[PDB]
A paper describes a structure:
S. meliloti possesses two BolA-like proteins (BolA and YrbA), the function of which is unknown. It shows a winged helix-turn-helix motif formed by four helices and a three-stranded β-sheet (α1β1β2η2α3α3′β3 in which η: 310-helix).
We successfully phased the 0.98 Å resolution data with one Ni atom per monomer. This first structure was named SmYrbA-Ni. The calculated low solvent rate of 37% could explain the high diffraction power of the crystals of SmYrbA–Ni and SmYrbA–Cu complexes. In SmYrbA–Co and SmYrbA–Ni structures, the metal atom is almost equidistant from its ligands with a metal–ligand distance of 2.3 and 2.1 Å, respectively. All these residues belong to the [H/C]-loop, but both Asp and Leu residues are not or poorly conserved in YrbA/BolA proteins.
Author numbering: 4 to 77
Write the structure that this text describes.
Amino acid sequence: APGDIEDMIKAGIPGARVTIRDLAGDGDHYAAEVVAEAFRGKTRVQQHQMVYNALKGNMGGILHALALQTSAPE
Ligand SMILES: [Li+]
Ligand code: NI
């Protein structure tokens, strides 16, 4: 449902700030920016792993369907 991706990320990575856009308005492929203190000192691969973990396998095709940008807070 709408908002579920954001909800799952925030539940799984407490303190994260999330900005989700639905590419093409298609309800299928998305792009997300996730900013979290837990990301500081982690590589982008490690940060992305945390986001995949938070989705708990609920989003089929997540490798391509959730394009990610992650960072620690500024
Ligand atoms: Li989309
Ligand atoms: Ni797809």
